[PDB]
Amino acid sequence: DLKLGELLLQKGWISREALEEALVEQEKTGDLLGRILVRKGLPEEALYRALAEQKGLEFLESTEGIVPDPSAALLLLRSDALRYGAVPIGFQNGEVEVVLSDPRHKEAVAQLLNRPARFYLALPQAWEELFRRAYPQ
Amino acid sequence: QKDLKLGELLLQKGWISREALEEALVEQEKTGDLLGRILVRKGLPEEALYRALAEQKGLEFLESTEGIVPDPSAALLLLRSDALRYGAVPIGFQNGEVEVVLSDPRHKEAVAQLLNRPARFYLALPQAWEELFRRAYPQ
Ligand SMILES: Nc1nc2c(ncn2[C@@H]2O[C@@H]3COP(=O)(O)O[C@H]4[C@@H](O)[C@H](n5cnc6c(=O)[nH]c(N)nc65)O[C@@H]4COP(=O)(O)O[C@H]3[C@H]2O)c(=O)[nH]1
Numbered sequence: 390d391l392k393l394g395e396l397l398l399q400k401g402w403i404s405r406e407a408l409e410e411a412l413v414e415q416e417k418t419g420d421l422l423g424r425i426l427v428r429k430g431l432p433e434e435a436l437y438r439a440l441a442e443q444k445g446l447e448f449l450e451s452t453e454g455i456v457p458d459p460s461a462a463l464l465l466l467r468s469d470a471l472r473y474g475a476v477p478i479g480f481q482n483g484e485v486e487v488v489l490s491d492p493r494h495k496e497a498v499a500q501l502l503n504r505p506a507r508f509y510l511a512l513p514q515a516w517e518e519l520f521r522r523a524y525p526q
Numbered sequence: 527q528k529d530l531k532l533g534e535l536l537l538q539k540g541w542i543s544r545e546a547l548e549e550a551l552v553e554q555e556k557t558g559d560l561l562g563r564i565l566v567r568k569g570l571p572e573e574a575l576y577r578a579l580a581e582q583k584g585l586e587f588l589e590s591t592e593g594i595v596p597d598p599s600a601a602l603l604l605l606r607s608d609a610l611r612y613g614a615v616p617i618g619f620q621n622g623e624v625e626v627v628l629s630d631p632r633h634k635e636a637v638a639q640l641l642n643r644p645a646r647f648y649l650a651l652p653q654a655w656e657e658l659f660r661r662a663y664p665q
């Protein structure tokens with residue numbers, strides 16, 4: 390499995406020197422590598438596609454057409470949906486479809502859901518819009 | 527940003543190296559291929575090409591067309607044959623401008639002259655463009 394910097398280097402979004410400079414910057418700042426690269430010109434959508442590939446998620450370019458199934462939303466308390474950044478939106482072939490806000494949360498969410506699931510990843514605004522739709526207050 | 531060449535823009539953005547751009551331009555010297563086509567074939571992400579080309583012609587790059595509900599009244603402003611020939615899908619209206627999604631930034635001027643009215647242009651990747659076209663203009 391590839392690290393994020395290598396995935397992006399291979400794709401050609403960043404240069405070798407750019408990756409080295411970002412890693413050197415991270416040694417002093419503690420920032421996530423992805424945030425540094427985005428600040429230096431990596432599109433956020435390109436970052437998220439690479440992070441999705443690294444964790445076996447499907448990146449969703451848009452959430453606007455999703456109609457959240459209330460039956461699926463039942464599988465997480467709203468408080469858990471927010472804290473874990475996970476919106477169950479529906480079912481497909483006996484799996485619950487779940488949209489994550491952060492690929493790092495895949496494992497924690499999957500363990501908790503404890504059932505076959507298909508994981509998606511969405512950018513922060515599209516995720517928030519989808520979350521409010523599925524879990525209205 | 528509208529005054530820079532494609533290579534310069536990609537260099538400025540950190541998406542191409544000076545070496546890669548030199549190679550591509552020298553090969554174009556012999557082949558006459560479109561420059562972005564050469565760069566992509568040598569490994570430039572197609573989306574990096576489209577983002578730079580969008581900046582160059584003042585177009586808004588669309589990461590996705592899947593959330594667009596094409597307004598049938600805007601689609602009337604182009605015959606289907608023109609929509610496909612010019613690679614332009616009129617999708618709606620905002621503030622008295624028509625919103626138009628292009629498949630190729632090089633066609634912006636020809637579409638603008640034809641529409642003859644205030645317009646807001648977008649650029650979408652080929653697959654995303656074709657999907658939107660077929661929705662706005664079923665056969
Ligand atoms: N939601 C979100 N998640 C992000 C972001 N950036 C990175 N991640 C994810 O969070 C994990 C920790 O990244 P890190 O703090 O930068 O720590 C990274 C980084 O310090 C470092 N390193 C990362 N990439 C490379 C590389 O290409 N070459 C070398 N030599 N070291 C790398 O290894 C550590 C683990 O790398 P990864 O396996 O890829 O695991 C990454 C990656 O899965 C972001 O902006 N947003």
Ligand SMILES: Nc1nc2c(ncn2[C@@H]2O[C@@H]3COP(=O)(O)O[C@H]4[C@@H](O)[C@H](n5cnc6c(=O)[nH]c(N)nc65)O[C@@H]4COP(=O)(O)O[C@H]3[C@H]2O)c(=O)[nH]1
Nearest residue numbers: 530531532533534554559560561562563579582630631632
């Ligand atoms: N849909 C689409 N459009 C594309 C593509 N590649 C380039 N274009 C666009 O089409 C125009 C013609 O580019 P070209 O035939 O390769 O002709 C180019 C190229 O031969 C050359 N040249 C291009 N970039 C550079 C550069 O950075 N430095 C130098 N010295 N010469 C360049 O100057 C000419 C004008 O360049 P531009 O102003 O950028 O104008 C470009 C650019 O707007 C593509 O792959 N797909």
